[PDB]
DNA sequence: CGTGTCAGAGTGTCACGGATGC
DNA sequence: GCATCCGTGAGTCGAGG
RNA sequence: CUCGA
């Protein structure tokens, strides 16, 4: 940049990838894979087949690939991340509130650095932490070591609400608790009829 | 609210869709006030 | 500052890496500020100078 | 010139390489949360960039000024806002989940109120449903129905007793 | 509020497949 | 062209902490 | 955490 900055443009972080997706011709890169797919060696063709699966979907649907890079993050309504009071006077909140709070904390600190014209080393190292915060809010633990809460317990991210036996699907959609029901010990009764 | 609707569509949420959903920006990081139990303005529980 | 959705970066296979033909580790180095990436190059100006 | 402003950014990048990674392990023991230590590091070096007095004398230990700034930030984070909230997490076990009671008692009363309401004159029924179901004022109902002020007062006075007649005749508990 | 030695985490699963990488 | 490594999965229900 | 089929 000090020498030939007039000639090229580069960037770091997530905002750079946002620029690559904009300067991207979907139809051309789709056809470029089709040429390799039409006549190619299996070693390097299978790796070209799978790319088309992703690229072709963006082309037909009419939805831009830019959605993979976020300028704004939605906040889930509060009753789905409720903060309950405890019989000891203190409080207890959902882990989603500590994740949303950490995104807000780091996003507001970045707003100060941009205003202050802080050195690029602090702004870039801050922007990195904002990426890890949104990564933790959406899927904590996916990349690297997860955000531990008090007691080295990993916080439950938004995507943790949908996975496995404790997730929303299996715990609250495939099976539910029902009214008009009970349970007790069973005792054999020979006098009863089969019905 | 009848229970017959054919398709359930999913897709990428544009950053412009996220603002279309939102009833305001969560600016401050505070939650509530720990005396009055009233949520702070522009916080994570802003009324 | 824009951020990327981890579902499409770290989720295997990397959906972003398939779109831009970038390697996963190289894509990891970019987003988390370990390496710059060239967004554009005035190739004709470089030739004329 | 332009090269003088770039020397200020090359100065900050220097103290990062010698102090940031060592300062991070200091905040990690004081808080216990790695993501919180990174927040302490950025705030500490931000004050170093705002204090030229600490970046001036290299013959004076600058690493130590950071450890005490980090100490003061963590002891301030350790005050009131952390005091109440930090304790519990709903996702964490040992916290009771919130419950809401059933609407059985409310549904039965609503059924009996709807029964006693049908046995009211169209004038009385259309006045109690505008004062208690719509919550309007005494003069608001008078303006809507095109009647006098005291007319709404008298209708409500009887219509309430008319319902008490219908409820007590069915054994509704006082 | 101001801040000028340094003090520093958990660790006994595994089968299986496929993208990831020297 | 291949060994490596990452991410996925691993019974259901009930009682007390 | 501890137990019941």
Swiss-Prot record, chain B:
Quaternary structure (record): The RNAP catalytic core consists of 2 alpha, 1 beta, 1 beta' and 1 omega subunit. When a sigma factor is associated with the core the holoenzyme is formed, which can initiate transcription.
What's this protein's family per the entry? Answer: Belongs to the RNA polymerase beta' chain family.
Name assigned to this protein: DNA-directed RNA polymerase subunit beta'
In which domain of life is the source organism classified? Bacteria
Q: What induces it?
A: 6-fold repressed by starvation.
What's this chain's function? DNA-dependent RNA polymerase catalyzes the transcription of DNA into RNA using the four ribonucleoside triphosphates as substrates.
Swiss-Prot record, chain D:
Induction statement? Expressed during growth in culture; expression increases from lag to exponential phase. Has a weak SigL-independent promoter, is also weakly autoregulated, no other sigma factor allows its transcription. Forms an operon with rslA.
Q: Where is the signal peptide, in residue numbers?
A: none
Residue numbers of motif Interaction with polymerase core subunit RpoC?
A: 39-42
- Reported phenotype of the disruption mutant: In a single sigL or double sigL-rslA disruption mutant, no visible phenotype; not more susceptible than the parental strain to several oxidative and nitrosative stresses. Infected BALB/c or DBA/2 mice showed a significantly prolonged survival time relative to mice infected with wild-type bacteria, although bacteria proliferate normally.
What is a GO molecular function of this protein?
A: sigma factor activity
Stretch list, region Sigma-70 factor domain-2 = 15-82
Q: What positions belong to coiled-coil segments? A: none
For region Sigma-70 factor domain-4, the annotated ranges are: 116-164
Q: Which residues bind DNA?
A: 138-157
In which domain of life is the source organism classified? Bacteria
One biological process term from GO is:
regulation of DNA-templated transcription
What else is on record for this protein?
A: Extracytoplasmic function (ECF) sigma factors are held in an inactive form by an anti-sigma factor until released by regulated intramembrane proteolysis (RIP). RIP occurs when an extracytoplasmic signal triggers a concerted proteolytic cascade to transmit information and elicit cellular responses. The membrane-spanning anti-sigma factor is first cut extracytoplasmically (site-1 protease, S1P), then within the membrane itself (site-2 protease, S2P, Rip1), while cytoplasmic proteases finish degrading the regulatory protein, liberating SigL.
According to its UniProt record, which protein family does this protein belong to?
Belongs to the sigma-70 factor family. ECF subfamily.
Q: What is known of its domains?
A: The sigma-70 factor domain-2 mediates sequence-specific interaction with the -10 element in promoter DNA, and plays an important role in melting the double-stranded DNA and the formation of the transcription bubble. The sigma-70 factor domain-2 mediates interaction with the RNA polymerase subunits RpoB and RpoC.
- Subunit description: Interacts transiently with the RNA polymerase catalytic core formed by RpoA, RpoB, RpoC and RpoZ (2 alpha, 1 beta, 1 beta' and 1 omega subunit) to form the RNA polymerase holoenzyme that can initiate transcription. Interacts (via sigma-70 factor domain-4) with anti-sigma-L factor RslA.
Q: What is this protein for, i.e. what is its function?
A: Sigma factors are initiation factors that promote the attachment of RNA polymerase to specific initiation sites and are then released. Extracytoplasmic function (ECF) sigma factors are held in an inactive form by an anti-sigma factor until released by regulated intramembrane proteolysis. Over-expression of SigL induces 19-28 genes including polyketide synthases, secreted and membrane proteins. Might play a minor role in regulating SigB.
| Name of the molecule in the record | ECF RNA polymerase sigma factor SigL
Organism, by scientific name, is Mycobacterium tuberculosis (strain ATCC 25618 / H37Rv)
